[PDB]
Amino acid sequence: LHHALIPHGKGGRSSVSGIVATVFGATGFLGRYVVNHLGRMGSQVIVPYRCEPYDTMHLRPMGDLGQIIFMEWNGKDKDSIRKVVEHSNVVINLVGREWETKNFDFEDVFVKIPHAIAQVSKEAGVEKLIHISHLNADIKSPSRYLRSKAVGEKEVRAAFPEATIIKPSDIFGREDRFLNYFASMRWFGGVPLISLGKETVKQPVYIVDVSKGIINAIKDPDAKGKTFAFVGPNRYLLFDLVQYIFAVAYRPFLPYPLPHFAYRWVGRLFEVSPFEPWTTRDKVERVHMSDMTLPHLPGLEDLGIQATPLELKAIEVLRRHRTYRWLTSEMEDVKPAKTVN
Amino acid sequence: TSVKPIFSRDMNEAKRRVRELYRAWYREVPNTVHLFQLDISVKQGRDKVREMFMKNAHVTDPRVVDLLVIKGKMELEETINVWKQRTHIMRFFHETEAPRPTDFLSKFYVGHDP
Amino acid sequence: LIAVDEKLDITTLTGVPEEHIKTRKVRIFVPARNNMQSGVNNTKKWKMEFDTRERWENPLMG
Amino acid sequence: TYKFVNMREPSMDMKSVTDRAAQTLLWTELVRGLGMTLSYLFREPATINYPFEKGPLSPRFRGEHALRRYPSGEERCIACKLCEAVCPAQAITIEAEPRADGSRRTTRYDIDMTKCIYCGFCQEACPVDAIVEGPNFEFSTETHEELLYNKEKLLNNGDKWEAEIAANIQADYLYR
Amino acid sequence: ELVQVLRRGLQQVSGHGGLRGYLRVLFRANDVRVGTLVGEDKYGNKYYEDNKQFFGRHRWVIYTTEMNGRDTFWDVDGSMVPPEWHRWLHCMTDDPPTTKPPTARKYIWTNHKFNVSGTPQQYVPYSTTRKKIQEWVPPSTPYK
Amino acid sequence: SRGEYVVAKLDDLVNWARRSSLWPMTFGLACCAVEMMHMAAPRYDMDRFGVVFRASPRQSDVMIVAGTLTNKMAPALRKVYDQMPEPRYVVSMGSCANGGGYYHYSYSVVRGCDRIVPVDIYVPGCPPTAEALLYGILQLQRKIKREKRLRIWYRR
Amino acid sequence: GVRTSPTGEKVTHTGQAYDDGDYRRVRFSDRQKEVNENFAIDLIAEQPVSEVGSRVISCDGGGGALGHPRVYINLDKETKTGTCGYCGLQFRQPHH
Amino acid sequence: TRPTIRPRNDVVHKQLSAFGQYVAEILPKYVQQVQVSCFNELEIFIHPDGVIPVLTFLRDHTNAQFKSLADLTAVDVPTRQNRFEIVYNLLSLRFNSRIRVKTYTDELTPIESSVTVYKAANWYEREIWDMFGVFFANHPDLRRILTDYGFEGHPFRKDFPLSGYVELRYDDEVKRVVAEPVELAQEFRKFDLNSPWEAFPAYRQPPE
Numbered sequence A: 001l002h003h004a005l006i007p008h009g010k011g012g013r014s015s016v017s018g019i020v021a022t023v024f025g026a027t028g029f030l031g032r033y034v035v036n037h038l039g040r041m042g043s044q045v046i047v048p049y050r051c052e053p054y055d056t057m058h059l060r061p062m063g064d065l066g067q068i069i070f071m072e073w074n075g076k077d078k079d080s081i082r083k084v085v086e087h088s089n090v091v092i093n094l095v096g097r098e099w100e101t102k103n104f105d106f107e108d109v110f111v112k113i114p115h116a117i118a119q120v121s122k123e124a125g126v127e128k129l130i131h132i133s134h135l136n137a138d139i140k141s142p143s144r145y146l147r148s149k150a151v152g153e154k155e156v157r158a159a160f161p162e163a164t165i166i167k168p169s170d171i172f173g174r175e176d177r178f179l180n181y182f183a184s185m186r187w188f189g190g191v192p193l194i195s196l197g198k199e200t201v202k203q204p205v206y207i208v209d210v211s212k213g214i215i216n217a218i219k220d221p222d223a224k225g226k227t228f229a230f231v232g233p234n235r236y237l238l239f240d241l242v243q244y245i246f247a248v249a250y251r252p253f254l255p256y257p258l259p260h261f262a263y264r265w266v267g268r269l270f271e272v273s274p275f276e277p278w279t280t281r282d283k284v285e286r287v288h289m290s291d292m293t294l295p296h297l298p299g300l301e302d303l304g305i306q307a308t309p310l311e312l313k314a315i316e317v318l319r320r321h322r323t324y325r326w327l328t329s330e331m332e333d334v335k336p337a338k339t340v341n
Numbered sequence B: 001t002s003v004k005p006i007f008s009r010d011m012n013e014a015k016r017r018v019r020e021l022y023r024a025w026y027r028e029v030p031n032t033v034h035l036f037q038l039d040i041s042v043k044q045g046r047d048k049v050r051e052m053f054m055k056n057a058h059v060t061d062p063r064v065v066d067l068l069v070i071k072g073k074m075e076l077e078e079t080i081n082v083w084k085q086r087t088h089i090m091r092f093f094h095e096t097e098a099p100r101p102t103d104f105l106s107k108f109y110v111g112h113d114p
Numbered sequence C: 001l002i003a004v005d006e007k008l009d010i011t012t013l014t015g016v017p018e019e020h021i022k023t024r025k026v027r028i029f030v031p032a033r034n035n036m037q038s039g040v041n042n043t044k045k046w047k048m049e050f051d052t053r054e055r056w057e058n059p060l061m062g
Numbered sequence D: 001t002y003k004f005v006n007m008r009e010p011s012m013d014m015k016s017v018t019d020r021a022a023q024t025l026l027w028t029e030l031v032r033g034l035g036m037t038l039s040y041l042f043r044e045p046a047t048i049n050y051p052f053e054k055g056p057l058s059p060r061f062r063g064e065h066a067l068r069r070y071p072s073g074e075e076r077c078i079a080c081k082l083c084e085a086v087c088p089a090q091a092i093t094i095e096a097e098p099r100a101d102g103s104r105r106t107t108r109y110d111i112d113m114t115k116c117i118y119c120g121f122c123q124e125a126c127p128v129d130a131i132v133e134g135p136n137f138e139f140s141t142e143t144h145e146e147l148l149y150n151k152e153k154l155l156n157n158g159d160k161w162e163a164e165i166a167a168n169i170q171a172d173y174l175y176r
Numbered sequence E: 001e002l003v004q005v006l007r008r009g010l011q012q013v014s015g016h017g018g019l020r021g022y023l024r025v026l027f028r029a030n031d032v033r034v035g036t037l038v039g040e041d042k043y044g045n046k047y048y049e050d051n052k053q054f055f056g057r058h059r060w061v062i063y064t065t066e067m068n069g070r071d072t073f074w075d076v077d078g079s080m081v082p083p084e085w086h087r088w089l090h091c092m093t094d095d096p097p098t099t100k101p102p103t104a105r106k107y108i109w110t111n112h113k114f115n116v117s118g119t120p121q122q123y124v125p126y127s128t129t130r131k132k133i134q135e136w137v138p139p140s141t142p143y144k
Numbered sequence F: 001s002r003g004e005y006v007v008a009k010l011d012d013l014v015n016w017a018r019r020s021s022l023w024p025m026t027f028g029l030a031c032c033a034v035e036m037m038h039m040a041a042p043r044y045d046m047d048r049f050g051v052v053f054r055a056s057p058r059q060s061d062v063m064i065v066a067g068t069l070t071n072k073m074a075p076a077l078r079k080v081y082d083q084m085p086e087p088r089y090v091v092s093m094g095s096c097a098n099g100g101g102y103y104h105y106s107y108s109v110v111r112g113c114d115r116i117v118p119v120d121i122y123v124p125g126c127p128p129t130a131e132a133l134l135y136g137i138l139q140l141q142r143k144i145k146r147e148k149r150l151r152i153w154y155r156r
Numbered sequence G: 001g002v003r004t005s006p007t008g009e010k011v012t013h014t015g016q017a018y019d020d021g022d023y024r025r026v027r028f029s030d031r032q033k034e035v036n037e038n039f040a041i042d043l044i045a046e047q048p049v050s051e052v053g054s055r056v057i058s059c060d061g062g063g064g065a066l067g068h069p070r071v072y073i074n075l076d077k078e079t080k081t082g083t084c085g086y087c088g089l090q091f092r093q094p095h096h
Numbered sequence H: 001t002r003p004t005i006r007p008r009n010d011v012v013h014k015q016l017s018a019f020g021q022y023v024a025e026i027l028p029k030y031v032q033q034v035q036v037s038c039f040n041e042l043e044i045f046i047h048p049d050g051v052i053p054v055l056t057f058l059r060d061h062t063n064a065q066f067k068s069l070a071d072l073t074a075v076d077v078p079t080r081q082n083r084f085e086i087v088y089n090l091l092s093l094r095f096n097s098r099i100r101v102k103t104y105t106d107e108l109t110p111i112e113s114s115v116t117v118y119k120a121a122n123w124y125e126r127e128i129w130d131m132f133g134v135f136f137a138n139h140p141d142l143r144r145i146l147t148d149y150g151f152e153g154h155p156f157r158k159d160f161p162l163s164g165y166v167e168l169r170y171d172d173e174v175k176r177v178v179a180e181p182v183e184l185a186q187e188f189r190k191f192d193l194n195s196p197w198e199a200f201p202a203y204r205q206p207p208e
C-alpha cells in the first residue's frame, strides 16, 4: 500500500479510510447514497458528471475539505473516462436510464458505457470494480432494459474479470421510482393492474441496505470477482404491495384490471414526452415481471447487512403523499401487508 | 459527615422521584412520536426511555439521583413544549453513527485505540 | 442534614462519554524542569494530563 | 448636570389651542415630513459607480496577505514563528529547516483565510516585514479549498502586489 | 437654466466620440460622465478624474474589452486593475502611476492577473513538506 | 443546429433574468450582518443591481450566511434553506461562515456553513467590506451567467 | 529556477513533488499546481559579494527601519565570506 | 510624577476598610473574611448559606443601599474541595460604591436562589447552572439558557475540553442535522507560555 493509502483516524469525516473511489452516475438516487456513505467514512471520492454543475450541489456537504472532486465526463470519451479513473483504486458504476433519449439507448447506457468503463479501468490499473446490474437480468427477458442489463453484465465480467456485480431487486427510498411510481397513480383515477397484480411477486430492497452492501463489498477482500443478489426480507404480490402503499399514503385504493396490450399502448403514449417520461413500455413490463429467486448467489446477510423490511421504512417515503388530514398518523396505524414466503 | 440534601433525604424518596419521572416519560412517548412526526415506533421510544434510565442504575448517592431526575425533568419539559426539534429527539438514537467494534481482534485490526 | 457512607462519584453528571470515562489513564505529576533554563518556577504545581492518542496527517494541506 | 428631554407643558391660551386644533385637523407635521422627503429627493445621491469607482482606503488597510522579498529577491521570512505565536485564531502553520545554503528558511507556510480574523497582529510581530496584509480585498473564491493559502500562493501575492505593498509600507512606516 | 443642463448633456453625448460611443459607455458602464484622462495602463483600461464631483466619485475607470485572454466587454471585474492603479483608484495616494511610477523589481509580475476562480487556472492547495517517515525497502534478491 | 441555437438563446434569456433579479433572504446572524446593511446603504446601493431583500424564504433566491453558525442555530439555517424554492444559491460571508473564524475550536460553533448547506460563493474577511460583498454578489451573477441547463438538456 | 518531476509535475522550491503512485495528484487534474517561479536561493546566489576594508561590518538589509535588525558580521576568516543570516548577504575583506 | 504608574486613592481605601469592618460586625454569623484590594475594591467572603441574609442586608440597610446587581458569575477552581466560587457584584447608587460578595459550593450542594432579592439573579443563576452545574434551590424556572438543546456537560468547567465531545453536520441519508463525535482537521496547538522565572516577588508563596 502507498503511504497515503493507509487508513487512519476513527472512521469519521476527517479521517483517512484509504479508499479512492470514482463513482459514475453519482448524481442520482443510488449515487447520492453511495457518495454519502463514502464521504461519511472519510474516503476520497471523484464524481464524474455530465449534467449542469448546479445539479451536483447536494453532493458538496457529503465529504470533508478536498474529499469530493468534481470532473467532467462524456461517456463516449475514453479519454475522459481515463481522466476520471486515473488515480482511483475503486471504480463504482451506477450509470443507467429507465428510458431512452435521442442520443443514448439501452445499448449505450447498459452495454457500451459499462464496457468502456471496465476496459479503461483495467488498463489504468484500478484494483476494484463494482458494477450495478438488475436482479431480473435475463438475456431472453421481454424488456430491452433487462436484455441490455444482461449483455452489459457479461461484457463487464469479460473486460474486468475481478469485478463485483451487484444485482438489486427494486430499490425503494425517498427519491425512488418504485414507491413513488405506485403512489403517484392517484392522479389518473384508479390503479391499473395487469391481471389485477395477482400474478406478480416482488421483494423490494432498501436503498440504505443497498448502499451499505456496496460499501462492504469494497471493504471485503473475499468479494473480488463475485455476483451478489440484494433483495428484501419479504416477498409480496403486486396487488398486496400496491394496496399497502395506498393504505400507508391514506389514499383511496381503486384497482382495476387493464389488459397487457392496452397497458403497452398507454405506456407508448406517455413516452413521447421530451422530458423524463412518467411511464414507458419497458417500465410497464418490468413492473409486471416477477422478481427472480436466486438462492445460489450471496446477499446482504453474507455481506453483513440485515435487510430492512418495507414496513419499517415505508412511512418515510409515503408520508409526503398524504394530505393534511393524515400527515400526523403514526407508523403502526397500518397493518403490514400479506407476505408470500 | 452531614451534608445538605438536595431532595429526598434518604434513598427511598429518590427512588420514588425516579418512578414518577419514569411515568412522566412513559406517558409522553406517544405524544412525542405524534407531534414530531417521528418514523420510529412507540415501542422503540419507550425502549429508548428505559435504556436511558438503566444506564444510571449503578448510582448509590441520593444527591446524584436527585440531580439526575432534575436533569430528566428539564429534558422532558424541553420535549413537551416542543422546544427540541426532531433533530435532537433523533440524536438520542445515534441513527448515523457507525457501529464501533468491541472485540479485541477487531479493535486491533482497525487502529491503535485501547 | 443527611449522611452518606459513599465515595463521591460525579461521572454520571459530568457528561463525558463512557469511552473517555473508562479507557483514560491520567497522569498526576510535577513537571520536570526544562533543562534549557535554570529557572524552577514551573516545577511547583502538580499537573494532571491524559494519555496520548493518535494524530494523523490531513490529506489536504498536510 | 442633567436635562429633561420631555417635561414641557403646552400653553392653554386660545391662540395656541386653535393652533393645536389646526395641527390635529390639518396634518401639519405630516406635511412637514413629506417636505423633508421631497428635499431629499431633489438632493444628489450618494452612490458610487462600483466597480468603476472604489471607496477610499488608507495605507493601514488590512486585506489579503502576502509574503515579501528583499530587493535582491531573497525571501524576508526567517521562520521565526512570531506570527504563528501571536496569531489569535491560530491560522498560520509554519514548518522550517536549514536550506541547502544553510539559511533559516521555511518549507511550509500556510494561512487558513477561513480561520483568519484579519487583525494584523502577524505583520506587527514580524521583525523583518516579511508577512504583510496587502491592499487586496476582492479575492472571493468559489470553493473552500481555494481559501487555504500556502507558501507558493502567498509568494505569488507578494510578487503581484509588491509595488503597492511597498508604497503603503513607505507611507505608514513612520507611525509604527 | 434648463438650456444649460441640456447643452451639458449634449456635450456629454459628443464627448464620448459620437452617439455610438455614448451608447457604449452607457450600456457597459451605466455612466455618461466626462473627465480628464489621467492615463492608460498596458491592459487597455482608462482612468479619469474629476475633482468637481463629491469625494468617492472623483476618480473612475473604464475597463477594457479584452484582458489577457478573456473577453471582458460585459463581464468587468473589480480586480482587473494593476496594483498601482488600484492604489490610485482607492485613494491611498494622490499621485498617479504616471506621475510617480512605483519601484521596479525583477521578481514583480510583469502581467497582472484577475481572480481565476472557476477556471482551470485556479489555485489548488497542497502540502509543501516532504515525507516525514521513510519506510524500509526489502531486498530485491531472493534468500535462503 | 437550429435546435442548439434556440436552446442557447432561451437559456441565455433565462439566465439573464435570474442574474439580474437576485432576492436575498432577510437573514443575518452576527457582526457580518452590519456590512450587509452597509451594502444596502446609499454608498454601495445593492438595489441598483436588482438585489432586493425579501423576508420570507419562499420568495428568496440567495441565502447570504453572514455570521457565526452555532450548534443551536444550524437546524434553523437548514430548515430555511430547504424552504427556499429552487433555483437557490448560497453566499457564505466572513470567516465564521466560511470556516470556523475566531471560534473554530469551540464546542458550540459549526466549523463552516458548508457542512450544512451547499455553498456557491465564499467571501473572505472579518468582516468583508461592503465592496468585498458586492464583488462576491457580482461573481455569483457571473457564475449564474455560465449555467447551461437547456443546453445540457438538449444534449441529454 | 523551476524543475520538472518525472511525472510531469513542477517541483517547488521546497522540493515538494507528488510520487508517481501518489493518489493525491488527482486534485491537479483539469486544474493547475501553484508554484512560484522565482527562487530566492537562486537570486541570492546571483547576488555579488561586497568587499569592505574592515574586520567587522554591519548589515540591516537596506532601508534602515524598513530592513531587518542590524547585525554585525566579523570578516576574519579568509577562507570564506561572512554571511548576514537575516538577508543572506555575503561580505569579504580585500585580499591579495 | 511617575507618569507610568497608577495613582492610588488612600481615602477610598480607608472608606472601604471602615465599611467592611462595619458589615463584618453587623453580620458575624455568616461573614468569614473581608478584604480590600489595592485598587480599592471591597470583597466579602461569607458562608454559603448566608447568601439571602447578607444580600438582603446589603440591599435594604440604610447605610448600604446596594439596589443594583451588577453581575453574578462563578469560577471553577478544581484544586479546592468546594471548586465553585459564586461571586456577586453589587452597585450602590446612593453612596456611589460597589461591593463584591463571594461564597463557595461544590457539584452536589445547592445554593439558595437570590431571585427574591434581585430579579436579574433569575437569568444569572440559569447561566451559572447551565455553564457550571451549580444548582439553585428555589428558582422559579431553572433550565439551560445558552447551550444547545439536549447538550450534555457543563462547558465552562476546567475539566471540559475546549472543542467538546460532539459536532454537528447535515446527513443526506437521514435528511436532518446529526451529532457525531468531534473530529478536527487541524488539532488545536497548545502552547506552553509560562516563563520559569518568578515575576512578582510580592505574591510568592511559602515553600511549605
Ligand SMILES: COC1=C(OC)C(=O)C(C/C=C(\C)CC/C=C(/C)CC/C=C(\C)CC/C=C(\C)CC/C=C(\C)CC/C=C(\C)CC/C=C(\C)CC/C=C(\C)CC/C=C(\C)CCC=C(C)C)=C(C)C1=O
Pocket (backbone or CB within 6 Å): F025, F026, F027, F028, F032, F033, F034, F036, F037, F040, F052, F053, F054, F055
Ligand atoms: C437580516 O438583517 C438585515 C439585513 O441583512 C443583514 C439588511 O441588509 C437590512 C437593510 C435592508 C433594508 C433597509 C430594506 C430591506 C427590506 C425590505 C422589506 C425591502 C425594501 C425594498 C423596497 C421597499 C423597494 C424594493 C422593491 C420591492 C421590494 C418590490 C419587489 C418587486 C417585484 C415583486 C416585481 C415583480 C412583479 C412584476 C415584475 C410585475 C409582473 C410583470 C408584468 C405585469 C409584465 C407582463 C406584461 C405583459 C404580459 C404584456 C406583454 C405583451 C406585450 C408587451 C404586447 C403584446 C401584444 C400583442 C398584440 C401580442 C435590514 C433592515 C436587516 O434587518
Ligand SMILES: CCCCCCCCCCCCCCCCC[C@@H](O)O[C@H](CO[C@H](O)CCCCCCCCCCCCCCC)COP(=O)(O)OCC[N+](C)(C)C
Pocket (backbone or CB within 6 Å): E027, E028, E029, E030, E074, E075, E076, F009, F010, F012, F013, F016
Ligand atoms: C415580462 C413579460 C414577459 C416577457 C417575455 C420575454 C420577452 C423578451 C424579454 C427581453 C429580453 C431582454 C434581454 C436583455 C439583454 C441583456 C442586456 C445586456 O447587458 O446583457 C449582455 C448579454 O446578455 C446575455 O448575453 C444574454 C441576455 C439575453 C439575450 C437575448 C435572449 C433572447 C431574447 C429574445 C427572445 C425573447 C422572446 C422569446 C421568449 C418569449 C451582457 O451584459 P451583462 O453581463 O449581463 O451586464 C453586466 C452589467 N455591467 C455591464 C455593468 C457589468
Ligand SMILES: CCCCCCCC/C=C/CCCCCCCC(=O)OC[C@H](COP(=O)(O)OCCN)OC(=O)CCCCCCC/C=C/CCCCCCCC
Pocket (backbone or CB within 6 Å): D024, D025, D026, D027, D030
Ligand atoms: C384628493 C387628494 C387629497 C390629498 C390629501 C393628501 C394629504 C397628505 C397625505 C399624507 C397623509 C397620509 C398619511 C397620514 C394618515 C393618518 C393621518 C391622520 O392621522 O389623520 C387623522 C387625524 C388625527 O387624529 P388624532 O391625532 O389621532 O386625534 C384623535 C383624538 N382622539 O384626525 C382627523 O380626523 C383629521 C382628518 C381631516 C379632517 C378634515 C378637517 C375638518 C375641518 C372642517 C372645516 C370645514 C367644515 C365644513 C362646513 C363648512 C361650513 C361653512
Ligand SMILES: CCCCCCCCCCCCCCCCCC(=O)OC[C@H](COP(=O)(O)OCCN)OC(=O)CCCCCCCCCCCCCCCCC
Pocket (backbone or CB within 6 Å): A055, A275, A276, F010, F013, F014, F149, F150, F152, F153, F156
Ligand atoms: C417565434 C416563435 C416562438 C419562439 C420561442 C418559442 C419558445 C418560447 C418559450 C416557451 C416556454 C419554454 C418551452 C420549453 C423550454 C425547454 C424547457 C425544458 O425542457 O427544460 C428541461 C430541463 C430540465 O432539466 P433536466 O435536464 O431534465 O434535468 C432533470 C433534473 N435533474 O431544464 C429546465 O427545466 C430548466 C429550468 C427552466 C425551464 C423553464 C423555462 C424555459 C424558458 C422559458 C422562457 C419564457 C418564460 C415565460 C414565462 C411566462 C411569461 C412571463
Ligand SMILES: NC(=O)C1=CN([C@@H]2O[C@H](COP(=O)(O)OP(=O)(O)OC[C@H]3O[C@@H](n4cnc5c(N)ncnc54)[C@H](OP(=O)(O)O)[C@@H]3O)[C@@H](O)[C@H]2O)C=CC1
Pocket (backbone or CB within 6 Å): A024, A025, A026, A027, A028, A029, A030, A031, A049, A050, A051, A052, A074, A075, A093, A094, A095, A096, A097, A098, A104, A109, A132, A133, A134, A135, A167, A168, A169, A170, A171, A172, A177, A178
Ligand atoms: N433504482 C432502482 O430501482 C434500481 C436500479 N438499478 C440499477 O442501478 C443503477 C443506479 O440506479 P439509479 O440510482 O436509480 O439511477 P438513476 O436513474 O436515478 O441515475 C442515473 C445516473 O446515471 C447518469 N446517467 C444516465 N444516463 C447517462 C448517460 N447516457 N451518460 C452518462 N451518465 C448518465 C445520471 O446522470 P445525469 O442526471 O447527469 O444524466 C445519474 O447520475 C442503474 O444502472 C439502475 O439500472 C438496479 C436495480 C434497482
Ligand code: SF4
Pocket (backbone or CB within 6 Å): D083, D086, D087, D088, D089, D090, D091, D092, D111, D115, D116, D117, D118, D119, D120, D121, D122, D123
Ligand atoms: S491577521 Fe490576525 S488572525 Fe489573520 S493571520 Fe494575521 S495574526 Fe492571524
Ligand code: SF4
Pocket (backbone or CB within 6 Å): D076, D077, D078, D079, D080, D081, D082, D083, D084, D094, D122, D125, D126, D127, D128, D129, D130, D131
Ligand atoms: S513573524 Fe515574519 S519572519 Fe517570523 S515566521 Fe512570521 S513571517 Fe516569518
Ligand code: SF4
Pocket (backbone or CB within 6 Å): D117, F030, F031, F032, F066, F067, F068, F093, F094, F095, F096, F097, F101, F102, F125, F126, F127, F128
Ligand atoms: S467573520 Fe468576523 S465580522 Fe464576521 S461574524 Fe465572524 S467575528 Fe463577526
Ligand SMILES: [Zn+2]
Pocket (backbone or CB within 6 Å): G059, G060, G061, G068, G084, G085, G086, G087, G088, G089
Ligand atoms: Zn542583512
